[PDB]
Design a protein around this ligand. Sequence first.
Ligand code: HEM
Length: 117
Amino acid sequence: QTIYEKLGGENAMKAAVPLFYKKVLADERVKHFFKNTDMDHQTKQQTDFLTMLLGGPNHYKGKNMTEAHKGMNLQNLHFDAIIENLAATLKELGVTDAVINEAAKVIEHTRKDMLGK
Ligand code: HEM
């Protein structure tokens, strides 16, 4: 009963993160930020990161959220787009509103670490 397990665990996270990128990469608000990103690497990192954040195993070895988005000067509308695409991804995969809201509430604390950096 971590949020990770409530979402369905490792197989669920492995399905969720590439679907979240399919949506982010179609979203006019954000898709261009990933123009030059190795998407295989990014999907691995973000899988490790959300797995750690939502109380699964902690194997995340990448940058902190300020370092990861340094120099992007990201704006509030970009963060809303990301959270909205993650919520729609979890909804499409059959997660209840309550469990999505629990997830979003944890992720929301990162917003001040990545905006405007
Ligand atoms: C606010 C809008 C966001 C945008 C536009 C964005 C975009 C990006 C981009 C383009 C990179 C790759 C940088 C590179 O290839 O050099 C990246 C790295 C990453 N972002 Fe975001 N991101 C955003 C929000 C988030 C959120 C909400 C999270 C999770 C809470 C997150 C987690 C990560 C992680 C784990 C990395 C990888 C760091 C590493 O490779 O060491 N990002 N982000």
